[PDB]
Amino acid sequence: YGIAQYREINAGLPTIVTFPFMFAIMFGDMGHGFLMTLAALSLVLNEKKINKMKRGEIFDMAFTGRYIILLMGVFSMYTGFLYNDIFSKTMTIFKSGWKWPDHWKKGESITATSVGTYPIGLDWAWHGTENALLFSNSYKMKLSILMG
Amino acid sequence: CIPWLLLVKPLHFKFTEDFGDIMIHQVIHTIEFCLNCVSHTASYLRLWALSLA
Amino acid sequence: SFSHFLYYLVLIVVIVYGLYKLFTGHGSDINFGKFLLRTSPYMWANLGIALCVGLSVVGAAWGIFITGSSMIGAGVRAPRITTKNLISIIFCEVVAIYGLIIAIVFSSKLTVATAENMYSKSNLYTGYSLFWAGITVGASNLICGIAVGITGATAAISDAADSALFVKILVIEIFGSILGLLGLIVGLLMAGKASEFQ
Amino acid sequence: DILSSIWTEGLLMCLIVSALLLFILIVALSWISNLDITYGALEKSTNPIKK
Amino acid sequence: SAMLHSLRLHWVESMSKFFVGEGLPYEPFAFEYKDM
Amino acid sequence: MTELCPVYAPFFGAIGCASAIIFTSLGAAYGTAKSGVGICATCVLRPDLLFKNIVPVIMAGIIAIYGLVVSVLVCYSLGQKQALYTGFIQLGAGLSVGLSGLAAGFAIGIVGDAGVRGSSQQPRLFVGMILILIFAEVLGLYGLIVALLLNSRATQDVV
Amino acid sequence: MTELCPVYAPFFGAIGCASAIIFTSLGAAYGTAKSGVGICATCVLRPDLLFKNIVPVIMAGIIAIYGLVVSVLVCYSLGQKQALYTGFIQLGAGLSVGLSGLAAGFAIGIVGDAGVRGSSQQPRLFVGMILILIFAEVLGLYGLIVALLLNSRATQDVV
Amino acid sequence: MTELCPVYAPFFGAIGCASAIIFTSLGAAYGTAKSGVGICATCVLRPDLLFKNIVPVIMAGIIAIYGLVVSVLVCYSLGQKQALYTGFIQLGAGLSVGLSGLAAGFAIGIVGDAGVRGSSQQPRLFVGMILILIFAEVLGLYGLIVALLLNSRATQDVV
Amino acid sequence: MTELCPVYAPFFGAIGCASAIIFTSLGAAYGTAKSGVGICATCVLRPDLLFKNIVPVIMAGIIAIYGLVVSVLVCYSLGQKQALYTGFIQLGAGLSVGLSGLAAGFAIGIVGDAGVRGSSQQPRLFVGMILILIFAEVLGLYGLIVALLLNSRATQDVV
Amino acid sequence: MTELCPVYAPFFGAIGCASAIIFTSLGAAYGTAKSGVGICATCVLRPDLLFKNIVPVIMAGIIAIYGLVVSVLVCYSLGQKQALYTGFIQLGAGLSVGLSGLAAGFAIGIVGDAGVRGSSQQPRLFVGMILILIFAEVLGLYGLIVALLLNSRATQDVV
Amino acid sequence: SNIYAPLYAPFFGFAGCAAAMVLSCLGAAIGTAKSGIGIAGIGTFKPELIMKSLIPVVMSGILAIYGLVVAVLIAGNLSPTEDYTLFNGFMHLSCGLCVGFACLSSGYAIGMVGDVGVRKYMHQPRLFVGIVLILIFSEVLGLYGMIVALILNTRGSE
Amino acid sequence: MEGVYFNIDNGFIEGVVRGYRNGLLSNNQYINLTQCDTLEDLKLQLSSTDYGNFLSSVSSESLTTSLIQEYASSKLYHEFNYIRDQSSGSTRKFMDYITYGYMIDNVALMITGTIHDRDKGEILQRCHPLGWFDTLPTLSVATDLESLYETVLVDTPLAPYFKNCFDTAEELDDMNIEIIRNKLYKAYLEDFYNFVTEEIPEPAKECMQTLLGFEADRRSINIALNSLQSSDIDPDLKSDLLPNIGKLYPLATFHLAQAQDFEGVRAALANVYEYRGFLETGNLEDHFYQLEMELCRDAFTQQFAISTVWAWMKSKEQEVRNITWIAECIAQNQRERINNYISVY
Numbered sequence A: 001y002g003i004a005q006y007r008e009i010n011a012g013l014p015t016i017v018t019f020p021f022m023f024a025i026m027f028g029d030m031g032h033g034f035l036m037t038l039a040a041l042s043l044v045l046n047e048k049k050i051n052k053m054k055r056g057e058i059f060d061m062a063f064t065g066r067y068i069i070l071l072m073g074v075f076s077m078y079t080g081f082l083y084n085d086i087f088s089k090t091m092t093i094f095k096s097g098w099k100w101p102d103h104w105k106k107g108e109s110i111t112a113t114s115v116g117t118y119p120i121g122l123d124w125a126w127h128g129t130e131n132a133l134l135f136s137n138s139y140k141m142k143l144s145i146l147m148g
Numbered sequence B: 001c002i003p004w005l006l007l008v009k010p011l012h013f014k015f016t017e018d019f020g021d022i023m024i025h026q027v028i029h030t031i032e033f034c035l036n037c038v039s040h041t042a043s044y045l046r047l048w049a050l051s052l053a
Numbered sequence C: 001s002f003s004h005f006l007y008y009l010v011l012i013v014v015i016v017y018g019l020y021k022l023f024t025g026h027g028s029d030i031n032f033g034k035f036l037l038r039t040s041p042y043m044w045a046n047l048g049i050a051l052c053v054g055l056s057v058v059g060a061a062w063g064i065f066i067t068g069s070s071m072i073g074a075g076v077r078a079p080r081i082t083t084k085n086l087i088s089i090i091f092c093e094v095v096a097i098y099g100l101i102i103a104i105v106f107s108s109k110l111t112v113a114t115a116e117n118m119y120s121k122s123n124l125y126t127g128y129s130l131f132w133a134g135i136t137v138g139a140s141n142l143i144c145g146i147a148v149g150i151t152g153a154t155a156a157i158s159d160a161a162d163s164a165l166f167v168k169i170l171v172i173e174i175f176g177s178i179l180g181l182l183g184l185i186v187g188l189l190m191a192g193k194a195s196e197f198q
Numbered sequence D: 001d002i003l004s005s006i007w008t009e010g011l012l013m014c015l016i017v018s019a020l021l022l023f024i025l026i027v028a029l030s031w032i033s034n035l036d037i038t039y040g041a042l043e044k045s046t047n048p049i050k051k
Numbered sequence E: 001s002a003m004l005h006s007l008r009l010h011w012v013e014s015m016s017k018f019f020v021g022e023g024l025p026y027e028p029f030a031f032e033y034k035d036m
Numbered sequence F, G, H, I, J: 001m002t003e004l005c006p007v008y009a010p011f012f013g014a015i016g017c018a019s020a021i022i023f024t025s026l027g028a029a030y031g032t033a034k035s036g037v038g039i040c041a042t043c044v045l046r047p048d049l050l051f052k053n054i055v056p057v058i059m060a061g062i063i064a065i066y067g068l069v070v071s072v073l074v075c076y077s078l079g080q081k082q083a084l085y086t087g088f089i090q091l092g093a094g095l096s097v098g099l100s101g102l103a104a105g106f107a108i109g110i111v112g113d114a115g116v117r118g119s120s121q122q123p124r125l126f127v128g129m130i131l132i133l134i135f136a137e138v139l140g141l142y143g144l145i146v147a148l149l150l151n152s153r154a155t156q157d158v159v
Numbered sequence K: 001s002n003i004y005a006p007l008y009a010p011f012f013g014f015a016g017c018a019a020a021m022v023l024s025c026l027g028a029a030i031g032t033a034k035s036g037i038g039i040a041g042i043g044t045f046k047p048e049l050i051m052k053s054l055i056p057v058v059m060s061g062i063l064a065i066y067g068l069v070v071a072v073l074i075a076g077n078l079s080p081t082e083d084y085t086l087f088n089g090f091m092h093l094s095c096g097l098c099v100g101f102a103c104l105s106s107g108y109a110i111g112m113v114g115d116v117g118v119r120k121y122m123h124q125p126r127l128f129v130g131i132v133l134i135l136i137f138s139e140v141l142g143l144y145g146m147i148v149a150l151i152l153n154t155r156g157s158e
Numbered sequence L: 001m002e003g004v005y006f007n008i009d010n011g012f013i014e015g016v017v018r019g020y021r022n023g024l025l026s027n028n029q030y031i032n033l034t035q036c037d038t039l040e041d042l043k044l045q046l047s048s049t050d051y052g053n054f055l056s057s058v059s060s061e062s063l064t065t066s067l068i069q070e071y072a073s074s075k076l077y078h079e080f081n082y083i084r085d086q087s088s089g090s091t092r093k094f095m096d097y098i099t100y101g102y103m104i105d106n107v108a109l110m111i112t113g114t115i116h117d118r119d120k121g122e123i124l125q126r127c128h129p130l131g132w133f134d135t136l137p138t139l140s141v142a143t144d145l146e147s148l149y150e151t152v153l154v155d156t157p158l159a160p161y162f163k164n165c166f167d168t169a170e171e172l173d174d175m176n177i178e179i180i181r182n183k184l185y186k187a188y189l190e191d192f193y194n195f196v197t198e199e200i201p202e203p204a205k206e207c208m209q210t211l212l213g214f215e216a217d218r219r220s221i222n223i224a225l226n227s228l229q230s231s232d233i234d235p236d237l238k239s240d241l242l243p244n245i246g247k248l249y250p251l252a253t254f255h256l257a258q259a260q261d262f263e264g265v266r267a268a269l270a271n272v273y274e275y276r277g278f279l280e281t282g283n284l285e286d287h288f289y290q291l292e293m294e295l296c297r298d299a300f301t302q303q304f305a306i307s308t309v310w311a312w313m314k315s316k317e318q319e320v321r322n323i324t325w326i327a328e329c330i331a332q333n334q335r336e337r338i339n340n341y342i343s344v345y
């Protein structure tokens, strides 16, 4: 973007964390984030050999930023945990705060009742529901506003 | 604060042709600041947009 | 020209049909009032939202390619100008942001209405307000995006020669973006009193 | 109090929605037709004096 | 797309807050292997 | 035949599903054609950039993914006895994504052509080309988002 | 006839089938014509490349196959007493496949022409042109997928 | 009013009366403008032919006389109680004379312009242009004859 | 709301009132603009010809007078309850005078710009220019005569 | 409502006011722009032409005054329970003044551009340019006169 | 119910609010773009005179303010729970058309004047007065349109 | 409007061409090149400019003014052909029409060498490589204008420009080739002006109409002055040589056709104020080049106009001419008129 002034607050120090984390917020997937983490780790652990060998334009890039991609992948895994989004699915790790009705006929629209709060991440009872978008969209818009 | 940010620095420069340049540059900075306030806050919704996509 | 002939033929057909209905005594049969009353306000609301977002995106893309072509053309000799003129592309995409926000606000008012109150005064007002405010926001964002793209192309071409040109053409580009901001303000004002369909 | 016997409200809504869609389609087709292949860089230079 | 959009949010939404810019890059007189 | 669910209501849903892919495919085709002209023009002089400069064609194709996604999601709520509200929701989503994708594809084609022609001469322009192409693609992304927002209301409280 | 199955319902299905075949034929024709122009212009100096440059023609010729498949599949769901929903679905599927394949044919004709013209001097551009042309065959495939998904709902739960 | 003599019957008669002079005046204006620019071009060099090459202007000025005659004879045969037969006949006569005089004026303008531009080269071109203008004026003469016959049958055996 | 004098009858009278001065003003403007272009082009060569070359502008301005007088005669013959036949006559007179004056102004401009251009070269071209301008002015005079004759029938034996 | 005074009656008056403003503004803008381009092109060379060439702009600006006057008058003459005869009269007045002013503005722009481009040589063209600009402005004045004469009858003997 | 206030009157009321803002934005954009082109053109050779050459841009942007004002006054009279008469809707549509097209004409004129006004002001500063007067003559068209729109909405409200 | 539809096809072309314009040497760089001592110093100074290391391969002893001109012209024509090869449609036709002007001069030079029997290598070297139709080296042998046209000119895009030259004698000499060049280039100017009017849009349409009018007036004056010294010129036949698209048309062109003396030429040109001072005093070609540079500078003020391509090409052709002049003055060490260069940037 541009070269900072002499003895000016460096923009590269907060970027290290903010840039991968904003990328993770936009990305938000624990399965795709895991694939990114593995792709970056392949470069990170084998960085000596890649440094020794010649690299192309697309290979020199994404290797000088191998740690960038590693941080983006780790943060994407974290956000996907906070979204409960593993390869577009959901993880039922904890107990949901939503309780479905005791009994209902097949094909009958049912609304869950609140019992508690989900400890970490979005509730997995929000997966496949009709109003899943109405909740996730508000959550993500307010998340964007707050973290911006 | 809008007149504050637009005027106080040029006023200090006047009360320490350069005055006109400073005054115009401060106007440009003020207008860009006020515009990109709402512009940046609105454009941070791209986080939600890309997450949803 | 085939298009001009088609336009003239359409005009002649419309005039002939109107005169035929008027002369025979059925002039009131061409009733735009009944067309507006009997048309579902869901149509107006959805068309307004869709055209708002579509025209906002069209204007954003219009300004984006006008500015980007000039930025790349002038960057062949001066590659340093791309990062500095990215503000022009930001000002072109902010109109798409405006259209997206207006679309969200209008979609918040898309509620299912009962059959008996289908064409009520409030529902018809909501449909008309959403349609026309969406049209206003979309067209204003289109116009603002085209203007901002032209201004950004000029700014990139001029600050390729000397970097002092960008700081003086950014004023004109901000003036251009003000048009999209005012379009958003007016679009919100029109739909401020328009309640959800009931 | 009907809009028309044949030009009903549903038919007119469908017709004008299709008219808007067809206008957008015609504009896009005009854009695609106006696209021209740049043949200059896809041919071998025939100048022996230069190149 | 998300990577480049975060680049955009850092260059425009974040750096314009505090990045004065227009600084002289550090290019010291150092010997390097110049490929032929 | 119900006043809330006319017999022409499925027309709007079907035509919105058709448009969602039609206009996005038109924009993607314009982008692919323009970027292919640029790539084939540059590869005569710089064949080493053949695979690096294919990015505009790739980003033009993502618009087609957005259109396909909206067309697939619209078909979920399509039915014979569907309300006019649902039909117009589907039509609005389809029109939004289609027109947004068409504009995005046009912009991607033009800017990608310019960028591939200008990056062979100046390699530093690849980053700028990629940035502007992302700015053009996020417009189709916004159209996708508006289509999804409309679709979320397609079959809620509908009777 | 029936309110849900009007007498004019087969009109939309016939128009859908006709558009599905016609627009895909137009796209394939544009692609074939422009790619054949490119081949005939380039083969005047490269007798070794009579083939290996007809691939744009071949990929342009698969769009017509997509249109034919959709037209055949919507013909078998056409009847005298068919619901207006079925007619709307058939029309939408036909329009989607036809107007996606038309764009695909335009893109294939332009890209393949550029690629064959470049390949007369740069043999490495053949691979690049092959990959770029797949990005329009995939648009045709997306249109075909949308048309098939629509046609799957033509008679599903229809009265 | 009577079904044979509606209140909108005078509309066609008024339109015919207006058109009979409007279109003949358009043709006369064309045939006078082109002839005049040619005459000025010829007279720039030699003024001897200035008063002799005015024949194309006069010939185009007789078309307006035909239009005026038809309009005068139409505005006398129309009233408030005239039938649709009379109104249609008046409109047909007006259109006939107007759109025949327009063609006659176009032909006269072209022929006269060419003749007066080439007149300095050959004196016999004056006689040739006169002969061709005689043939071109007869088109307006035929239009006038048709209009006169129609107006003769306008109010004959009319109830 | 008599059938012979419908409520919408003054609409055609008002349209003729406007058109009598709209199209005559259009033709006068065209003639004045073209003649003024010619004069100002030829003013540098000779300033004395400026007062003699304004004749095309003057005769172009008489067309507007024809439209104005036809309007003032028409525009005072309107009423709340006027016959549809009277409205048709007023519309016909307005259209006739307006579209005859438009043609007259077109011909006057086209003739006059060339005439004043040639006057800088041939001083004796002035008489021929005056003749052709009179010929073109008679075209609008014919429309004026037709409109005046029509207006005599507007409220003659009208119930 | 009433047959003579329907609910949709002031639509014609509103359209007349809109037409007056729109067309007079377009005419004035065209005149001002076509004058100013020549002003910039010619005034660079000479000092005293800054006010020799503002006359076309002043003349073109009076057209907007005519539109303003007519529109203000018809606004003050508009009403809710207004007979459609008044609406038709206001529509005719607005159309007449607006389109006559549009013609006058176009003529003023063309004449001013030509005269300013040709008047950089000597200032003797100034009087002729003033005369021709007055000739063009008289067209807008005639349109104003027609509109005022109409609006005087807008609410005269109206039930 | 009310014969003079049908439920479709807000359609025409908003059509004047949409047209006013859209056409004022169009005129302002035309003026600003066609003035910025000239400003950029003179900047390469005479960048010092750009400082005072923004006048066409600033007064073409005021047309958008005229449209915003008229649209705000039109939209303030529109409410679902209010008897919006068809007279008022038609006359607000007239407001919008009048002000929007007057501002569009003003923007076109300002664009054509600032495209060549600043490109000739760079040669000498003596043409500044003439250019400013021509630009004022261009802006008064939008001023007239706004005045007509204000009178129209004031009369339509009562 | 202007830039709404331009950047779809010509945005990159305009950007690169205006960057090239930014690369034109300014007055300071011209002065710095003037203060050089040897051609090697001139090459080193040009390295710091936007020419880059275009003379890097050239050795110190091989460095010559002719070779410097050759490399500068080659770089200019490579840039022009690259710009043309990145454009299509109306812009490509515009570039082709630009090339046709050099192509006519090339065919005229080849014919002049054919009758003059000059060295083939030097004849090829002197020809402008931008205008090169495939049968151009064939011109070194063909002499008869009928055989000329049928075997060469019908093949070339110069075929429409050869219409009324069949009237003259079949044997071809220096006067015949001069009049054939004048007639061909006049027809080319008419066709190019028509193409600009119909296809080239505003504001490039008006700008290139003015530029083509200036070019037509320039060549009309040149033809009149070159035929004044000849006593075999017919006043009516000279109208077929003077272009009819310039500002001189029609009155001044008519007077020039009837002009037979230098004072007569001045009286003919008295209609236009700009061209009066050119013959009033000073070097006529210097005034033409100065006004051409001024018109190019004015053309570069308009944005989203394709006339900037023509303005660039004329400007950098003049730049190469100035570089050649400076190099020749340095090599000959005759720096009395070394500062006789024309620059506006």
Ligand SMILES: CO/C1=C\C(C)=C\[C@@H](C)[C@@H](O)[C@H](C)C/C(C)=C/C=C/[C@H](OC)[C@@H]([C@@H](C)[C@@H](O)[C@H](C)[C@@]2(O)C[C@@H](O)[C@H](C)[C@@H](C(C)C)O2)OC1=O
Pocket (backbone or CB within 6 Å): A058, F051, F052, F054, F055, F058, F061, F062, F064, F065, G131, G134, G135, G138, G139
């Ligand atoms: C044939 O199927 C290929 C593409 C198709 C049809 C995709 C559809 C799903 C499309 O409809 C969708 C919409 C777009 C899409 C999902 C493109 C991804 C392409 C692959 O990219 C990972 C390339 C990639 C392997 C190839 O293009 C290059 C060899 C390359 O690897 C070269 C590298 O130098 C370069 C860095 C890299 C970059 C540009 C991605 O591409 O596969 C192909 O061709």
Ligand SMILES: CO/C1=C\C(C)=C\[C@@H](C)[C@@H](O)[C@H](C)C/C(C)=C/C=C/[C@H](OC)[C@@H]([C@@H](C)[C@@H](O)[C@H](C)[C@@]2(O)C[C@@H](O)[C@H](C)[C@@H](C(C)C)O2)OC1=O
Pocket (backbone or CB within 6 Å): G051, G052, G053, G054, G055, G057, G058, G059, G061, G062, G065
């Ligand atoms: C005779 O008409 C040919 C095909 C027809 C009628 C297709 C329609 C049914 C249409 O509905 C479509 C296009 C169905 C389709 C997909 C056909 C594929 C055909 C073969 O394509 C691999 C070539 C193949 C036998 C041969 O003709 C090729 C030219 C070639 O032998 C040349 C080789 O150099 C090259 C490497 C390779 C291909 C890939 C170019 O095979 O059949 C033809 O031509």
Ligand SMILES: CO/C1=C\C(C)=C\[C@@H](C)[C@@H](O)[C@H](C)C/C(C)=C/C=C/[C@H](OC)[C@@H]([C@@H](C)[C@@H](O)[C@H](C)[C@@]2(O)C[C@@H](O)[C@H](C)[C@@H](C(C)C)O2)OC1=O
Pocket (backbone or CB within 6 Å): H051, H052, H054, H055, H057, H058, H061, H062, H065, I131, I134, I135, I138
């Ligand atoms: C002023 O009234 C003239 C024309 C008008 C207004 C005509 C309308 C009534 C229209 O309704 C038409 C055209 C009726 C018509 C046919 C008129 C002929 C008039 C005279 O024609 C004898 C010429 C004639 C005197 C004049 O044109 C020439 C001087 C000339 O005398 C030159 C002679 O050398 C030549 C032999 C002769 C020939 C060409 C007729 O014309 O007066 C005029 O202009």
Ligand SMILES: CO/C1=C\C(C)=C\[C@@H](C)[C@@H](O)[C@H](C)C/C(C)=C/C=C/[C@H](OC)[C@@H]([C@@H](C)[C@@H](O)[C@H](C)[C@@]2(O)C[C@@H](O)[C@H](C)[C@@H](C(C)C)O2)OC1=O
Pocket (backbone or CB within 6 Å): I051, I052, I054, I055, I057, I058, I059, I061, I062, I065, J131, J132, J134, J135, J138
């Ligand atoms: C701009 O105000 C002028 C006329 C206006 C307003 C006309 C309208 C009422 C319109 O509705 C029309 C055109 C009716 C009308 C009333 C025309 C009178 C023109 C005058 O002519 C007597 C000249 C005339 C005084 C003037 O033009 C010249 C000085 C001249 O006297 C020079 C003489 O050498 C020449 C012989 C003579 C000829 C050409 C008539 O004109 O006034 C004007 O211009």
Ligand SMILES: CO/C1=C\C(C)=C\[C@@H](C)[C@@H](O)[C@H](C)C/C(C)=C/C=C/[C@H](OC)[C@@H]([C@@H](C)[C@@H](O)[C@H](C)[C@@]2(O)C[C@@H](O)[C@H](C)[C@@H](C(C)C)O2)OC1=O
Pocket (backbone or CB within 6 Å): J051, J054, J055, J058, J059, J061, J062, J065, K133, K136, K137, K140
């Ligand atoms: C800029 O308009 C001025 C006020 C404005 C904006 C009025 C608008 C409502 C106008 O838009 C409307 C359309 C009405 C209008 C058109 C007024 C003309 C006024 C005067 O115009 C004669 C000039 C006049 C004093 C001045 O502007 C002239 C240039 C001049 O000073 C120059 C002198 O050399 C010349 C002898 C003389 C005139 C006759 C050319 O006065 O007042 C002004 O300030």
Ligand SMILES: CO/C1=C\C(C)=C\[C@@H](C)[C@@H](O)[C@H](C)C/C(C)=C/C=C/[C@H](OC)[C@@H]([C@@H](C)[C@@H](O)[C@H](C)[C@@]2(O)C[C@@H](O)[C@H](C)[C@@H](C(C)C)O2)OC1=O
Pocket (backbone or CB within 6 Å): B024, B027, B028, B031, C171, C174, C175, C178, K051, K052, K053, K054, K055, K058, K059, K061, K062, K065
């Ligand atoms: C980006 O727009 C700016 C502010 C915005 C957005 C205003 C809108 C809300 C507008 O809708 C409002 C409503 C009206 C308007 C338009 C105000 C203009 C203010 C300044 O204009 C004087 C400009 C700016 C042009 C100014 O700072 C110039 C540098 C200058 O001061 C330079 C001087 O040489 C020149 C003499 C002087 C002229 C134009 C009077 O302008 O402030 C800006 O930043």
